RNA sequence: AAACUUUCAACAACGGAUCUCUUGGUUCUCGCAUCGAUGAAGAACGCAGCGAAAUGCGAUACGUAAUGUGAAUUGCAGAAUUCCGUGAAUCAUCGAAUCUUUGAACGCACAUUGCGCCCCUUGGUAUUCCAGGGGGCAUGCCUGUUUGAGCGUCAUUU
RNA sequence: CGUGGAGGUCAGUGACGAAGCCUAGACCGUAAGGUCGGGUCGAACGGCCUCUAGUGCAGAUCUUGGUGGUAGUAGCAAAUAUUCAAAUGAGAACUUUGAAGACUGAAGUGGGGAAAGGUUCCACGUCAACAGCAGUUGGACGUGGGUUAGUCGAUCCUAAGAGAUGGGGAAGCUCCGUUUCAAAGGCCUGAUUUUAUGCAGGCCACCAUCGAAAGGGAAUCCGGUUAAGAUUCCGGAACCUGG
RNA sequence: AUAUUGGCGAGAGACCGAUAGCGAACAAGUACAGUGAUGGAAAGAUGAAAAGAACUUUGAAAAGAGAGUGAAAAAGUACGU
């Protein structure tokens, strides 16, 4: 949809920011259990339903 | 071919985002949220949907104002400020 | 953006979403006492408002660039 | 470093506004360097100074208006007590202890005496 | 707890599909869909004669 | 006779049972009574030197002010004068403030960041046009003020 | 006979190895089972007298999880089809360049769009997984860059319709109804120029709002320009609305 | 004087012990499917301390063989048993 509403574009931007792997230095912190960004999204595997 | 060949035709959205719930359940041709019943005054919730109520009841949000009520009650709603002993 | 400056006499700024062309115009005019020709805006895909500003011939974008402090 | 509230309390409005604009200017000038320099923690002190200065301004203003309405009723809807809803809507002790003439007379006549049973 | 193993909406698939007649959870696409519940033998189902 | 098949044993495999742990859960008892038009519960979007989440926060944005404690935080660099001190801390406490866009949601609407109106102020040679800033404009209801309407009706005029 | 827990007792056992696990090694009982030696391991456990129970598995097309024989088998065969040399690389049928042979044949395998998709676009590095073979390649992975309007659209009007207010039903969430049984207003003109604006006038009956990215509608073209943007930028030349 | 699976603050158990116990001992009402009402998971444990394997050698590289820390690498981030 080339003609899209501002709210949709806002969601677009947020998703684009969220799509990212871990800032690696997290894995060094004390008592860290995080391993990978389990909530990553990909445009071929899981549609947004918005 | 009522199955797979038909499934190719579905490209017109019926529900979109609710200004209140933000769940994409706003049936447009009726102008009504399914989850919130947005245009209506009160929230749309029912007693049989236990999990439904549990997914939205109080305490699952930020409680931007309710969190400090207990603190204020404990301290008796004092006014003024400390005294710098 | 750097190319734009020394070629088009253009400055590039990121501006708060609530701003509008009038507000950018007046703000630049008083922040840098430069005379502005026109303002041209858009929203980048990351949700920030990018504004190109074109200054009249009486001023040099490059000359004020290093004065602002980035070059 | 940064500014300290206790000596900021002493200055007057004009000095405050001038200081605030100086701090904003310094913030922008430091921000522009930040994008080229890989890392630059001096943001924190500047922004906290902004916060402190604005807070001092706000206290000064509200104190002034509080004095201006001091000692007379009907002061604005957000300077009085934000206790609750119910507490605001309940009776104040003045009327809560209001009693009819008949009741007051009867209580004065026959108060509950204080007695004991040993002998 | 009284509500043990019942906070769901399962039901039987009935015969004819070469599976057990245990009631099973609906839905789909989440790994939990299709397993059993409500049974003393089901994983995560209620116990026998819940202690009162 | 080998290979092949089968059984058992040692070692190496696949798999995570068993054993032992537990900041969790479950039930019982005791005490307390505190949400919201001064804008609640809830939602969206944003905020960090280096962040995706959880947690915290609202353009004063992992926070400001106030009090107490009295030397840190930590994954890396930085800050150190703040160390016999109106003073570190993602500390504790918490009475002062900010509180984006929303939300019963309140100028009119909303699949839009749409369209109004009033007051004060600033510039554009301006009461009328354009623009910037600040403050305003819901409904039902109660008491009161002010202005009204009806041959419903009273008196008084010529 | 055995199991999870409880009261008592053996001043019970143990980092000089408790619990568990393996052992065609041993002993005891008809059995349920118990006991020992050897290896492995690393932190608690047992006997006896009593108490209590969510207490003993082969099955239930049982439930969850795991793994086989089948088997390196079925198979990987529509859309006419590929070939030579060089370059790159450890590696080349599958990457690039050149050379050749081909097809789509303008109701195209071409050039743009609407619904939807949401960074796939473009650049740099890179191949653990994905592209049911390969892979130096990619719509994959990692780090970044990129979308510019007075004139293109939305917003503006109304259609089929939806829907407040005045009102009337219903115990009630709420239902009807759209100019309806309503006291449903703003408009010009001047006046005063203390002065904001009532005080002078006259006018007018309909009477909210939403509802089209293909209906109605004010206005822009040409050349050039990037890795990616253009009727949006640059250059030149115009037009509309409001004052 | 009585009720109370909600809220807030406390105290306990002949309760369960990671397929049990709330569904959730973890970034759980999250990941995920459905237009929607709704449906809804899996996943706890190296070691006292990272001391998380310097250096050599074969390999394009992943890796391997040595060397080394550790009481143990029959603990090597595919980490107790
Ligand atoms: Mg259709
Ligand atoms: Mg439809
Ligand atoms: Mg634009
Ligand atoms: Mg054996
Ligand atoms: Mg042993
Ligand atoms: Mg141990
Ligand atoms: Mg049983
Ligand atoms: Mg069995
Ligand atoms: Mg049997
Ligand atoms: Mg079976
Ligand atoms: Mg064959
Ligand atoms: Mg074959
Ligand atoms: Mg075939
Ligand atoms: Mg044609
Ligand atoms: Mg195209
Ligand atoms: Mg393959
Ligand atoms: Mg391969
Ligand atoms: Mg591409
Ligand atoms: Mg209606
Ligand atoms: Mg319209
Ligand atoms: Mg034209
Ligand atoms: Mg293009
Ligand atoms: Mg031009
Ligand atoms: Mg060992
Ligand atoms: Mg071990
Ligand atoms: Zn909703």
Q: Token digits for E34?
A: 């299709």
B1 is in an annotated binding site: no
Instruction: Find out if CATH 1.10.3720.10 is the number for domain D74-119.
Output: no
- In the block, tokens 């445009």 appear at A43
Neighbours of E52 (CB within 10 A): 4
Domain boundaries, chain D: 1-73, 74-119
Mutation to test the C interface, candidates A8, A13, A18, most C Cβ within 10 Å: A13
Angle at C57 between CA C52 and CA C61, to 5 degrees: 45
Of D68, D62, D49, give the one whose Cα is nearest residue D8. D49
- In the block, tokens 């002790």 appear at D93
* Experimental resolution (Å): 3.6
Distance in Å, CA E41 to ligand 24 centroid: 38
Determination technique for this entry: cryo-EM
Of C67, C15, C71, give the one whose Cα is nearest residue C44. C15
| Residue in chain B nearest D80 by alpha carbon | B79
Question: Cβ neighbours of residue B56 under 8 Å, at least 6 residues apart?
Answer: B35, B43, B45
Q: How far is CA D82 from the centre of its chain?
A: 10
Mutation to test the D interface, candidates B77, B78, B80, B84, most D Cβ within 10 Å: B77
- In the block, tokens 């209140």 appear at B20
In contact, E24 and E34? CB cutoff 8 Å: yes
Cα D25 to Cα C68: distance, rounded to the nearest angstrom: 12
Question: Cβ neighbours of residue D21 under 8 Å, at least 6 residues apart?
Answer: none
E21 Cβ within 7 A of any nucleic strand G atom:
yes
């Amino acid at each position: 949809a080339a003609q899209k509403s501002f709210r949709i574009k806002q969601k677009m931007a947020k998703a684009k920011k969220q799509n990212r792997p871990l800032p690696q230095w997290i894995r060094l912190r004390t008592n860290n259990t995080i391993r990978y960004n389990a909530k990553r999204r990909n445009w071929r595997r899981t549609k947004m339903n918005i | 071919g009522k199955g797979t060949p038909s499934f190719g035709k579905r490209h017109n959205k019926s529900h979109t985002l609710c200004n209140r719930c933000g769940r994409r359940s706003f049936h447009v041709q009726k102008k009504t949220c399914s989850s919130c019943g947005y245009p209506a005054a009160k929230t749309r919730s029912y007693n049989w949907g236990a999990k439904a109520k549990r997914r939205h009841t109080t305490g699952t949000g930020r409680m931007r104002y309710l969190k400090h009520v207990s603190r204020r009650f404990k301290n008796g709603f004092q006014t003024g400020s400390a005294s710098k002993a | 953006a750097m190319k734009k400056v020394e070629d088009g006499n253009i400055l590039v700024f990121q501006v708060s979403m609530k701003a509008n062309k009038y507000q950018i115009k007046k703000a630049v005019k008083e922040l840098y006492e430069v005379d502005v020709l026109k303002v041209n805006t858009l929203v980048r895909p990351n949700g920030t408002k990018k504004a190109y500003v074109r200054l009249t011939a009486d001023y040099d974008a490059l000359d004020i660039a290093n004065r602002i402090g980035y070059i | 470093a940064g500014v300290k509230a206790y000596e900021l309390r002493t200055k007057s409005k004009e000095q405050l506004a001038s200081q605030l604009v100086d701090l904003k200017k310094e913030l922008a000038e430091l921000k522009v360097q930040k994008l080229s320099r890989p890392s630059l923690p001096k943001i924190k002190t500047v922004r906290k100074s902004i916060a402190c200065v604005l807070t001092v301004i706000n206290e000064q203003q509200r104190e002034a208006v509080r004095q201006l309405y001091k000692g007379k009723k009907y002061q604005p809807k957000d300077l009085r007590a934000k206790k609750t809803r119910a507490l605001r809507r309940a009776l104040t002790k003045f009327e809560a202890s209001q009693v009819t003439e008949k009741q007051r007379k009867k209580q004065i006549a026959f108060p509950q005496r204080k007695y004991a049973i040993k002998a | 707890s009284e509500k043990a193993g019942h906070q769901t909406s399962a039901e039987s698939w009935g015969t004819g599909r070469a599976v057990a007649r245990i009631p099973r959870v609906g839905g789909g696409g989440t790994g939990r869909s299709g397993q059993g519940a409500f049974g003393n033998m089901c994983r995560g189902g209620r116990m026998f004669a819940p202690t009162k």
